[PDB]
Symmetry: C2
Subunit: 385 residues, 2 copies
């Protein structure tokens, strides 16, 4: 961190403070202030033309100015020679991660008009025309084309960004190679731990910040869709019944599913430990006739057998919870809507829009169980350095 | 292979010959001969009672007798230490892989009645009742409960199955360690390469055999569903137009997508080559103070940087093709059905059933590419094991 980041003690803190000041000036007052001055309409089209509308273009100017003010503060205070990749570089990655969420809510808002058109078509033959369907696909391809261009440039940029981190650290380590040479375990602390640190930290950083963004974007649309689901199957009418049930079910994908699988990383460590122990007796067996004695290697293999057999049995418990959850998840999204489907309040557009937002919110809490590898791996690497 | 399978030269081939004889006696007659006896039923329920209907469990008897006859031939001729795991163990994995395909077909056939009920409900309020919906989701949980209890026992068995392969190899390499001692890297090949061989070979073995089964199971239903889609969007009426368009689009995940990404495995190798060269230069500089120097390590790292940069640029081409395919695939399944949706010849149930078939068939061709990748990885591992026998022969 000391390399590739200007003073990480006050950086990552002045950034977080500045983010809250900018957000409070936008989402808790203000925001409409600049929008009213410029005369923004305040309406957002479902088409791909939303991304260059006046409402969105205001945010782009605000983001650049706020980052520009933040950059100019650090571009004079403590220059670091990696500013344009450390401060400006990560600002683009945060912004692009937010933009790729707005394309997600754009297609989600597109299912409501598209599938309401399918429902109209199936109810009566030739009530709609074929030319009406093509202009609905032609709108989705506008959003999809934007997502394709931004996503490929996002992965292209972030891959250099993590590589400029290795270039920065190796520049610092090599300049002190005369003292760091004698340290045991080198030539992988500088050759293998540099990438596995930068690559995994960025992966955790974007994934964690993507979870917050996709919850901020998709919880409000669940709330505004909860007006069309007044009642739930078994518990009857409950205020905000849809979002409360959506949150609780989504936690099951990272709660009970993670509780039963918390012992798996512990058992995995023991298996690789006994594998390394088997290696140690095997490597000494090559150089000498003694060691790797056939009575002895039988002991080490009987020790790796039992540790694998215990992992297989414990992973069976995790498989039952995970597989059953996925199978039920195919119909739980539709299960909640049964008292509303029968009542005629929900149309086909909302039924597939509500089903879609369930997956996106589920993919948010997925960034706890699925990212758990990165959270523990970051500390597994930062301790060596 | 010789340490686990009995005479892999013939058994691993005679099994394929025996399968064709058993299949020809089943799918080209004979199956009706044994179904005519005992009456059978002919029809198949959509419920979870599908898997013990008279149509199926006669096939279970046929499978057991055929593998039992095949195994009995190899248990009398050329006996082996790992007979039950190598022959009966492999046969169960093949059968369970087939069974989970029939579970996927069962839920796919369940979409037609369920979604035709949703379409009925949305067209007129209170034309359906809530209890009518609970019965439809009731029969799905019956199939899902069968799926989970067989899938977890499948992974439990196959994980033990690959370990009996590793146990088999070590029992053969040990007691020969006195001759294999002097080979370079013998320790890591007897520990790491003997596990990554069995672990990845089964991944290729089941994925390749899963792709064939899910194509054999889902192409006929796709052809049957093609009667409800007489016309295609642009090309007009085409015989079997749905399945022809489904296959061509599914090959796009193995054609254009694979062609642009063919250079990636080759380009990745050079990256790890230069990176291992960097490690090699560092280790020699760790022992000798004059080996690293401010030059050389600067120059050789510049070869690491200039080689990664060509991977990022080339992977950008693969991203455009892959991401665009996935984005379009969200609506291409519905694009073909547009002239049929407007014509009223299709319902909501068939629209979801046809769309679901596209995903399963697409995953079949996905399984073939992953099978090829696992096979080429296996060759990278099999060469080490093939060469390891230097001293034995
Ligand atoms: C990392 C180090 C460098 C980080 C530099 C950050 C500088 C902060 C600049 C300002 C960012 C916030 C501007 C306003 C954001 C806001 O209001 O929220 C938007 C979403 O918030 C963001 O995307 C901001 C993310 C900031 C994250 C800061 C984290 C700092 C530390 C990260 C460590 C990793 C959505 O607003 P909206 O709904 O009005 O926009 C959409 C609408 O249609 C148009 O109005
Ligand atoms: C190592 C290999 C060990 C032995 C492997 C098995 C050898 C013996 C297999 C004999 C039985 C094979 C199936 C015959 C039945 C048949 O026709 O196949 C059915 C299914 O075919 C299969 O694919 C089943 C699995 C057989 C696969 C055989 C592969 C052998 C080669 C393996 C080589 C190693 C890998 C389809 O029949 P159906 O549609 O009428 O029945 C199903 C229907 O729903 C109700 O009847």
């Amino acid at each position: 961190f000391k390399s590739f980041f200007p003073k990480p003690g006050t950086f990552f803190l002045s950034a977080f403070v500045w983010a809250l000041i900018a957000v409070i000036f936008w989402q808790a007052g203000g925001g409409d202030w600049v929008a009213r001055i410029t005369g923004a309409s305040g309406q957002i089209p479902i088409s791909a033309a939303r991304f260059w509308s006046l409402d969105f273009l205001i945010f782009y100017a605000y983001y650049i100015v706020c980052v520009g003010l933040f950059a100019l503060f650090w571009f004079i205070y403590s220059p670091h020679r990696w500013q344009y990749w450390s401060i400006l570089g990560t600002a683009l990655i945060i912004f692009v991660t937010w933009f790729l969420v707005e394309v997600g809510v754009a297609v989600n808002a597109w299912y409501a008009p598209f599938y309401d058109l399918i429902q109209t078509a199936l109810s009566s033959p030739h009530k709609v025309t074929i030319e009406q369907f093509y202009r609905e696909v032609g709108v989705f391809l506008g959003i999809a084309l934007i997502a394709v261009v931004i996503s490929v440039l996002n992965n292209f940029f972030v891959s250099h960004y993590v590589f400029r981190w290795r270039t920065a650290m190796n520049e610092y380590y090599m300049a002190n190679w005369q003292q760091l040479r004698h340290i045991e375990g080198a030539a992988q602390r500088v050759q293998e731990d540099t990438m596995r640190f930068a690559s995994t930290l960025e992966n955790m950083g974007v994934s964690f910040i993507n979870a917050i963004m996709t919850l901020i974007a998709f919880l409000p649309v669940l709330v505004t869709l909860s007006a069309h689901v007044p009642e739930l199957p078994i518990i009857g009418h409950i205020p905000y019944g849809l979002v409360i049930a959506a949150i609780v079910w989504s936690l099951m994908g990272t709660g009970l599913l993670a509780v039963v699988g918390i012992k798996l990383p512990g058992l995995e460590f023991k298996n690789q430990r006994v594998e390394a122990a088997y290696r140690k007796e095997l490597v000494y067996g090559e150089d000498d006739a003694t060691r790797a004695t056939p009575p002895t290697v039988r002991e080490l293999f009987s020790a790796v057998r039992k540790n694998y057999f215990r992992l297989y049995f414990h992973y069976m418990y995790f498989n039952i919870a995970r597989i059953l959850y996925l199978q039920v998840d195919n119909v739980f999204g539709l299960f909640l809507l049964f008292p509303s489907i029968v009542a005629g309040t929900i149309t086909l557009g909302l039924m597939t829009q509500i089903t879609n937002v369930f997956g996106q919110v589920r993919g948010a809490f997925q960034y706890l169980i699925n990212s758990w590898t990165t959270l523990v791996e970051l500390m597994s690497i930062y301790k060596r350095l």
